[PDB]
Amino acid sequence: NMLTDMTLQGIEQISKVYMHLPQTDNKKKIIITEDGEFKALQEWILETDGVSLMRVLSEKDVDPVRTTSNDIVEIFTVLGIEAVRKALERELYHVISFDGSYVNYRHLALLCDTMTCRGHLMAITRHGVNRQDTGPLMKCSFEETVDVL
Amino acid sequence: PGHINCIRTHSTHPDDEDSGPYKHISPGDTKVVVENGELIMGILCKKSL
Amino acid sequence: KRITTPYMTKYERARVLGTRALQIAMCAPVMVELEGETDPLLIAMKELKARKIPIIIRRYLPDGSYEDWGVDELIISD
Amino acid sequence: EGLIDTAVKTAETGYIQRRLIKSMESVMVKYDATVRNSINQVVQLRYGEDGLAGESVEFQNLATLKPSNKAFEKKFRFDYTNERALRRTLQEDLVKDVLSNAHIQNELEREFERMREDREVLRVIFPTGDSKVVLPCNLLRMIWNAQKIFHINPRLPSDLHPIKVVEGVKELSKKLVIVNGDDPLSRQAQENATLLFN
Amino acid sequence: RQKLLKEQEEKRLREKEEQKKLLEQRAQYVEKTKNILMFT
Amino acid sequence: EEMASDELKEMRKNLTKEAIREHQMAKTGGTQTDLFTCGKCKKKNCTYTQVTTFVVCNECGNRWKFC
Amino acid sequence: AGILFEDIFDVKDIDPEGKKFDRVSRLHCESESFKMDLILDVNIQIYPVDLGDKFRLVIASTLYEDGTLDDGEYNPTDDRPSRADQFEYVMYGKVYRIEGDETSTEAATRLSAYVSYGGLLMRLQGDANNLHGFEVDSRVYLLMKKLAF
Amino acid sequence: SKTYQDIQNTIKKAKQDVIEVIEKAHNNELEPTPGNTLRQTFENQVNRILNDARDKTGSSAQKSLSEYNNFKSMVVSGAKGSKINISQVIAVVGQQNVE
Amino acid sequence: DDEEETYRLWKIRKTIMQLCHDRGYLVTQDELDQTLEEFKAQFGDKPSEGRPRRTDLTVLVAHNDDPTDQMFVFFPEEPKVGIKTIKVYCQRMQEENITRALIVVQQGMTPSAKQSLVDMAPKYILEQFLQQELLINITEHELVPEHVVMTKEEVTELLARYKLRENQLPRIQAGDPVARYFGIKRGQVVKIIRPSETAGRYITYRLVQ
């Protein structure tokens, strides 16, 4: 019991952490100078196998402003639905633009809007879209055809 | 058609051209320029068509 | 106090043209001079440019209201 | 590997595409100019936060984003004090109207204060200094179209009163209506919806 | 210049509103601290 | 730690320095060049790799490609 | 008239950037009397030049000596006496850029007139006054001829 | 026939490079490049070497092609193919990965 | 610890002040952004059985316009709050005209105590926050747009402009962190001011439910 688990130092679920200088302008610190230039700063970031977010944010010397989480469900529980919407679009825009391709913002705004329209995170599956009060003839076309009728 | 105006770079366009001289007069016939719906400069390719 | 767009939507344009072309094909009175053509869509298109389509578009609002727009009233797009 | 991935990619993606369409089939643009669903539940107040279709927009550049607090000033300011430089640009009977009239000079200075405030807005909109933006009308090509249509000859002094621009832009800003209405709640949203293009 | 001076003095008035609000919050804190005392 | 022998202090300092060095992420490789000017920060400190030339600015992290 | 420019030039280089196309080469030149710099593409296939060659280059607005300002369409069948009859190399094109040493206050002393003969670019460059004949989007002819001296 | 020589030279250098990486790891001198095991740093070095090799030989393939070349003309028009397709045809195929 | 609890106590108190300032109440600019040193000098810098003990850094703050509208923000010592602890808390709210409150527990309260919170509800509106949740101001986050709680007079004008039933608006659930920040209740509209990349700004509304 003491060997496996005693948490000598650190927080749980953070299975391991990597320490990175950003190379790109994506995770670089941005600071408007005193002359109006932008001046990308190069600051250390930590990048993680694991999520916890609230025990992380609370740590001293850790930016409680710019500390994002990738797991959209942690974002729903910790930062609330309007942050999910922003973060979900950021995640979904990352998986789209990674390969160099571009999708218009309308469509990304729209899906993230539909998924976050009833307050709870609304999943694009039977456990989400058929629990919505849409009406039976809509629901039965998708999945669960006999059951919802 | 019409009187289009546009500017594009052909795929072989050297990066260090826009800095130096010959900017508006490309040795390689890169830098596509369309004015009044006329092709003035440049080779066309995927980047322009 | 009409609040809707003063422009003829592409969907309105499609079905108004289609609808009027149907009526034309059914021996309706034309509201425009025929310079010697016979296609009901060609006719309908002509009529459309003349703003002479004898049709009003009932646009339903989400609340349940509606606004009626003559064809000659709204701004044709194409 | 490629052959393998092909055969599996076809089966999975086709189901994701289906689920997408079924969770957003009834979403449409009502005559209200609002984005609703089958229940009449409002999704977006304006389509894409901006009220504008997907086909007509283009990539463009914000000019006032990322110059610096001095290159921005000597480029968006319109000094009316340098007497020699305005006879270069403007004709002889416009360089006195801006060198004497204190109304025209307050107007031109007030416009630059508006651009300086728009500049700070831009920098809270677009942190990370990202000039590239998607908008309806390609301004820079329109300008260029204008130069080739009227035969501009950018080497003569122009006859365009620096105030006709300031006031024509104000009157143009009016005609670009997304949210119709005179209500404060409607004016605010009209102002918002057309903020970036403005 | 006069407009700059009048705007500056108006900023001083808002400073003074902070002064009266701060004394006000302090003024009710003496009455309230009695309630934190009797609470326990 | 402060009461330890000078040998044990220097050993701990070396182990701590090695642990820090091992946990430092490898800097992403590529050919450093001044041939490319960054469109965002206008600096010339760039790194390229050819696969199409991919370019990264070492100052602002901006990335772009040439075909 | 309509003689927008004239001088003698010599070929200082035939293609100093290195021959980029097979039938066309970047002549670099300076002028004898007005001391203009010139870059000029020519059909090196139908009209060959070497280094140190001299040619009289007459940039014209029209072809006809009386200056009657032709339209801009091809008509081979024409009796009217032209300027082309005393030249060897004749081309037709648009001045597509004019560029100069303008300051914020004072005027320019030097111009570069850039013209495209249907793709074959030319930059004639030097004294603004000797280049006062050129205006952007005007049509223009080349009219060059090799001097045997 | 000059390009062939350059390629072969590059390739030999590459094969040579990897032997020293193998020697270092075989004699325990390849120190784990921070954020890696031993077996990972090795694989990285190798792939770097080899990728470098492919990139370099690809470049001399492009540089050798006459303006009359027909692969080039379909790559610089963007019609069909990429610069790596010329590399693979003329110079080297490259490293075959699974997963 | 003794030093880390002083740090944590001050952080919580700072976020509570920025909370009650966003809720509309009246907080001095000194109590809003005080630093850790004068937090040491103010109480005792010794929480390990000393002078900055909990239930002494508790705060009462009165509303900005109604100077009789107050709210307590209690601080239990009990990690897991129970009915008799919140019975006393409630017992001495009755001596005054205070109704609203706020329980900053260390560990979670018991599910039986939560009832007493709802049972006491319409007469004394109280709510719980974990000390853990309070360590950060979530409204400061870069993902969180700007939230403005609309007044009853202007919710009707919004639903009246759009000709829109409150049933047809997007939703935000009562337990949402941002909902608990503002202390909004069921049937309450939330304005949201978003920086838009295609428009520049976007204002959207969310109904609490």
Side-chain angles (χ1 to χ4, degrees), chain D residues 47-95:
Chain D
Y47 177 45
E49 308 169 346
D50 76 1
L52 296 145
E55 301 94 299
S56 306
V57 301
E58 303 196 50
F59 290 101
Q60 309 203 56
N61 261 271
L62 305 163
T64 52
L65 205 64
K66 61 189 288 177
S68 76
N69 287 318
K70 181 186 288 184
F72 169 67
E73 180 149 6
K74 64 180 60 176
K75 203 203 178 173
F76 295 97
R77 178 80 184 259
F78 200 82
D79 68 336
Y80 37 76
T81 76
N82 186 1
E83 195 190 59
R84 296 186 44 88
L86 312 191
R87 275 83 60 89
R88 309 295 321 287
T89 89
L90 305 163
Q91 298 191 329
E92 277 301 347
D93 44 90
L94 278 67
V95 285

Side-chain angles (χ1 to χ4, degrees), chain C residues 4 9-10 12 59-60 62, chain D residues 30-32 36 40 55 180:
Chain C
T4 47
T9 86
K10 66 171 179 264
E12 284 169 349
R59 296 172 163 183
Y60 297 106
Chain D
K30 297 290 193 177
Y31 274 97
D32 195 6
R36 327 226 188 184
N40 209 261
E55 301 94 299
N180 195 9

Side-chain angles (χ1 to χ4, degrees), chain D residues 32 36 40-42 44-46 48-50 125 133 179-180 183 185-186 191-193 195-196, chain I residues 150 157-158 161-164 167-170 194-205:
Chain D
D32 195 6
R36 327 226 188 184
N40 209 261
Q41 301 156 348
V42 55
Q44 296 174 346
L45 285 158
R46 298 290 133 157
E49 308 169 346
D50 76 1
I125 314 311
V133 68
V179 186
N180 195 9
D183 185 315
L185 204 84
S186 148
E191 191 271 346
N192 284 341
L195 176 75
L196 214 56
Chain I
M150 290 176 102
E157 174 57 35
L158 154 71
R161 195 273 173 200
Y162 305 107
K163 308 176 190 296
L164 186 139
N167 179 240
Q168 322 179 333
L169 293 169
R194 286 206 312 241
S196 164
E197 93 188 25
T198 43
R201 202 177 302 108
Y202 187 62
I203 289 189
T204 181
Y205 308 93

